[PDB]
Structure formats: structure tokens, C-alpha cells
Amino acid sequence: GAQVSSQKVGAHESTINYTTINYYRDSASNAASKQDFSQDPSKFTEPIKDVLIKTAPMLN
């Protein structure tokens, strides 16, 4: 059941990996993976009904 993932190596001394085994039945007991996703800011930065083209007049 071992999970093996790569570290993003900052200061250096191939790919370095690290190993994770979950010891408990409840996902709540688990550490945080920090394997997270980014998303586009659009829902807050561009919430307009008509798609904005930045080279064009915002008002036409």
C-alpha cells in the first residue's frame, strides 16, 4: 500500500522521491499530501457574461 511521489528539490547537494503509508482507516487521520491544483482566477477577475478580449474596447 505504499505511495511514492516526487519531491520538487530546491537546493541540491535524477528525481528524488518520498514514501507515504497510511496507517489508519479514516481519511481524516491522514497527513496532507500538498498535491494541490491551481485554477484560473476568471470567476472573480472576469465574471462578465460576455467574454473579454483585452485588446478590444471593454465597452462597445
Binding site: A2, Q3, V4, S5, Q35
Partner: peptide, 5 residues
């Protein structure tokens, strides 16, 4: 066994 990410 092993999962590799």
C-alpha cells in the same frame, strides 16, 4: 504494493 506519483 506501491503507487507512484
Amino acid at each position: 504494493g506501491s503507487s507512484s506519483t
